Amino acid sequence: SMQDTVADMLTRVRNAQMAKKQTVSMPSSKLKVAIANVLQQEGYISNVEVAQEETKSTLTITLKYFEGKPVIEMVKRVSRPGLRQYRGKDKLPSVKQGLGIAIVSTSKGIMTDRAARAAGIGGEVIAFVS
Amino acid sequence: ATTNQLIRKGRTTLVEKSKVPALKACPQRRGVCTRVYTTTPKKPNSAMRKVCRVRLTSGFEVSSYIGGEGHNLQEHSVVLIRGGRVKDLPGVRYHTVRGSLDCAGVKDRNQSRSKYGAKRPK
RNA sequence: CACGGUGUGGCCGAUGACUGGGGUGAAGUCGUAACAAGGUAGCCGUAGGGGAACCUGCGGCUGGAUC
RNA sequence: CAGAAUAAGCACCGGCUAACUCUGUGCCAGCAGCCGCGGUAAUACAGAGGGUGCGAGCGUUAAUCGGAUUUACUGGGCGUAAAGCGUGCGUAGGCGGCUUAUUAAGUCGGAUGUGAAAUCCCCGAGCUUAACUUGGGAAUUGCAUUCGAUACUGGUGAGCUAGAGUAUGGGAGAGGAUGGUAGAAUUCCAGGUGUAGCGGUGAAAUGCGUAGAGAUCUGGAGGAAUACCGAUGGCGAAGGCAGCCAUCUGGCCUAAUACUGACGCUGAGGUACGAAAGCAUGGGGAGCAAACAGGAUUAGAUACCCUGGUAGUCCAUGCCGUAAACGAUGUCUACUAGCCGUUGGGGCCUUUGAGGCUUUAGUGGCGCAGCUAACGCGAUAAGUAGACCGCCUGGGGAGUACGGUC
RNA sequence: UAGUUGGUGGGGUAAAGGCCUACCAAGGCGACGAUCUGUAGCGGGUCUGAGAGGAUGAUCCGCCACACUGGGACUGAGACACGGCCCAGACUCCUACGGGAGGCAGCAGUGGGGAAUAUUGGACAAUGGGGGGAACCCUGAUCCAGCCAUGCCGCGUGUGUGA
Numbered sequence A: 001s002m003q004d005t006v007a008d009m010l011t012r013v014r015n016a017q018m019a020k021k022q023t024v025s026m027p028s029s030k031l032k033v034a035i036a037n038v039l040q041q042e043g044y045i046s047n048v049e050v051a052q053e054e055t056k057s058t059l060t061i062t063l064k065y066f067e068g069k070p071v072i073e074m075v076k077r078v079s080r081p082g083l084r085q086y087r088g089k090d091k092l093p094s095v096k097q098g099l100g101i102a103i104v105s106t107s108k109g110i111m112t113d114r115a116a117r118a119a120g121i122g123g124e125v126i127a128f129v130s
Numbered sequence B: 001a002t003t004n005q006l007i008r009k010g011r012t013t014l015v016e017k018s019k020v021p022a023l024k025a026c027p028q029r030r031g032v033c034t035r036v037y038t039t040t041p042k043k044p045n046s047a048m049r050k051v052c053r054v055r056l057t058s059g060f061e062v063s064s065y066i067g068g069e070g071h072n073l074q075e076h077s078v079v080l081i082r083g084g085r086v087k088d089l090p091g092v093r094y095h096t097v098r099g100s101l102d103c104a105g106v107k108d109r110n111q112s113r114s115k116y117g118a119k120r121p122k
Numbered sequence C: 001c002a003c004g005g006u007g008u009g010g011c012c013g014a015u016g017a018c019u020g021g022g023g024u025g026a027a028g029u030c031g032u033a034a035c036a037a038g039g040u041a042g043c044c045g046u047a048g049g050g051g052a053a054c055c056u057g058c059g060g061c062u063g064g065a066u067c
Numbered sequence D: 001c002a003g004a005a006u007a008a009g010c011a012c013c014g015g016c017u018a019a020c021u022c023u024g025u026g027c028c029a030g031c032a033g034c035c036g037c038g039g040u041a042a043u044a045c046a047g048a049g050g051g052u053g054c055g056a057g058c059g060u061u062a063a064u065c066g067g068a069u070u071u072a073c074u075g076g077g078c079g080u081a082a083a084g085c086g087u088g089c090g091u092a093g094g095c096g097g098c099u100u101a102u103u104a105a106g107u108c109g110g111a112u113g114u115g116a117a118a119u120c121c122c123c124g125a126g127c128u129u130a131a132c133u134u135g136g137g138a139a140u141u142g143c144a145u146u147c148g149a150u151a152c153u154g155g156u157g158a159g160c161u162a163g164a165g166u167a168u169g170g171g172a173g174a175g176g177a178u179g180g181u182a183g184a185a186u187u188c189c190a191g192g193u194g195u196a197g198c199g200g201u202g203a204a205a206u207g208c209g210u211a212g213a214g215a216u217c218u219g220g221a222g223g224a225a226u227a228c229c230g231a232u233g234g235c236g237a238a239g240g241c242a243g244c245c246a247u248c249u250g251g252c253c254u255a256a257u258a259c260u261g262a263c264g265c266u267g268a269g270g271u272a273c274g275a276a277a278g279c280a281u282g283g284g285g286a287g288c289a290a291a292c293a294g295g296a297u298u299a300g301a302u303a304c305c306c307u308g309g310u311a312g313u314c315c316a317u318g319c320c321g322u323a324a325a326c327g328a329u330g331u332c333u334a335c336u337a338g339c340c341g342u343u344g345g346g347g348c349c350u351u352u353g354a355g356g357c358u359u360u361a362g363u364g365g366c367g368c369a370g371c372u373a374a375c376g377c378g379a380u381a382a383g384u385a386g387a388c389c390g391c392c393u394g395g396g397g398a399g400u401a402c403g404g405u406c
Numbered sequence E: 001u002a003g004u005u006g007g008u009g010g011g012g013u014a015a016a017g018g019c020c021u022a023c024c025a026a027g028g029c030g031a032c033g034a035u036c037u038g039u040a041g042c043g044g045g046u047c048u049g050a051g052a053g054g055a056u057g058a059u060c061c062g063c064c065a066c067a068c069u070g071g072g073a074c075u076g077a078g079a080c081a082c083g084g085c086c087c088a089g090a091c092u093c094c095u096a097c098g099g100g101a102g103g104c105a106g107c108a109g110u111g112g113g114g115a116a117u118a119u120u121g122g123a124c125a126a127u128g129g130g131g132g133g134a135a136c137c138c139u140g141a142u143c144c145a146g147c148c149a150u151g152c153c154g155c156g157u158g159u160g161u162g163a
């Protein structure tokens, strides 16, 4: 059965980018919305929309391409239900020497690894993006 | 293997076995020559190799190779044996130290004398 | 209560007339089972038979050539 | 104070690996960490000359970690190289849909106490230098208490319907169990016609036949299996399931409403089923046929071929638990170009009846991207990801021995 | 697993406590591995490794345990006491056969084992320890010396010229 919806979202994004889609849609949740907002702020995607027709809600992401290649070259789930990963402020991972971003869930919200370092807090490492 | 499988059962490590069990982790061993004889090598080698059967202080009964040209060993000699394989004589895993206890140093040598135990000629 | 004794059992090691299979060496003897459709396609399970590779029955596979 | 006066060896030179020739010997003597040298021009054996590396040391043996991503947490694999249990169900456990309030266990941050000295590291100091000694730091990645944060995970309360399940209509099927029945054919028996062969092989022979065979026609007995349909078709968890009819019975597909409201996925132990052969008790026995007998072939034939033929193959009730039990590919979930078939349904469109578009659940052929050592796989993945389980660690010895369970 | 798990009365100890005892109850531990069995002193540290890990626990420091093999207690603030006592066991020694004696895993040393590891040395001058008012006495702790290329570091075995 489906037990990791965050990994499902990342996999949908990766497959859509590999298939050169312009738009990718999925069932929505607040966690996926926060992750998509972080990606949009960092510039990996263009637009984030949420359509709430009924009790069901659909999340839509607009993808970006640049010089014939997708902007997101690597997206990797790090913490998983079978093995959760938590790091302190001094052990936050760096993605290819700072040219990437590690998405971190902290007690002050979802933010990037450098933002978490600036705020001096740790948390759960959700994904690596580059 | 999944993380849960690793937690339930770890990673096993296979212990190694010594190639010189008769030494019993010692650098050398004393022994008494039970037999002094000659054997033939395996293919593609052909020669007449000088071997002894030695009873060690460890309790084992092994075979050792005599190196160099010319040896004075006979049955009931007291010798010192170290590790070392010949690789052309099956079942021979040890060497006899020339010039230690009853083994004499090889004569007429002037190169590589420390092996074969030949003192420096004047 | 320590040590000791008696009876009866369990476990560990050593040793033993004789006996079974295994490996290595060397090519002495009998055959030619497999590799080509290997000259009866091969192999798997099982059962019976035979100096020996092996043979035959029943079911299965293609990891079988040619039509 | 006197005088160069008292003071230099060890390993190696085929490649890995810096350093090459000559004599002696001729698979001998010997060398060897691995690959390998030696059988008359040996840079690989022994000596010599020369050189190379170290140097009061130089080599060998033993031992630990490394190289070894060669147990892979960091950081590996299982179609064919070793590796998916034969297949299901399910216990403990692991993991688990969306919204919201709360809690602060996991998680994160601060403060305080502690984490002996020595040791490691840094800056100095004293040894004629260095080893060594020593001052001060840094470090001791940890533990405990207490105060905070609430994104995620967990707990609790409430709510929801996209997962899962229930009721009602309709449909396809060799799905399973029991009983009955029909037609073709083989064998045997009796009879009619009728007379010298029949059968078998590469060729023969064993065998059958003048007390009459084989052939042909009529009538009886019995057992086993279901031609054509028949299909890259169908059904079943797998093993497997084919004439027709009735009875009992499981699953699946399909439409729209209504209903419950996460009731789910996987699954160590466990348990159920599980081809063929085999075993036990009692029946049955046409055909076929291990064992066996005879005839051939052959140097021999124990076999392949031929004539016979017992167990068995069949039924009832139980056991056994193994197969190249194979897609050599564990189960569940989501996503990722297209083209052409076929099976069971739903919808729409033409216009009178047969076609054309779609959609869904199976079953096939190609093939973009991606993957792979290659072969190849490619929406029925061996692609992209997640959850759980099983398994592998050079070839033999060996799925073997001892012990144990059945 | 049957003082076994808990409770009550009593005993006992410097002190909590099944530590002991008499009753009452049926409890307690175990797949997060009880019971049984093999091996093993533990740590600060040491070696290796980029790290994570792996191996190791000489010399220095902390803790524990043992003192020929087992069982006890006495004295004392403190021991169930290496060079104290009692009992049992094995072994060794003297004897005039009456009777006695002993425990190097302290330092040195002997025999044996092994591939292999040293002197039957000096002084209490220094730092400590015991006794004493002190003088001072004792101290194989210690400080030194002897032996070994075992390791690390340093130095020498000559320098210039000379075809």
Ligand SMILES: NCCC[C@H](N)CC(=O)NCCC[C@H](N)CC(=O)NCCC[C@H](N)CC(=O)N[C@@H]1[C@H](O)[C@@H](OC(N)=O)[C@@H](CO)O[C@H]1NC1=N[C@@H]2C(=O)NC[C@@H](O)[C@H]2N1
Pocket (backbone or CB within 6 Å): D327, D380
């Ligand atoms: N989701 C669940 C669905 C379950 C269902 N199973 C569907 C499924 O999942 N299928 C997966 C496909 C895997 C397939 N089994 C592998 C394969 O096909 N060969 C194995 C690989 C061997 C080799 N690398 C290729 C090879 O030699 N090929 C031959 C070849 O082309 C040709 O032979 C000759 N002489 O020219 C042909 C004619 O016979 O035979 C093929 N060989 C075969 N053809 C058969 C076939 O397809 N199947 C059964 C078996 O018989 C197969 N062997």
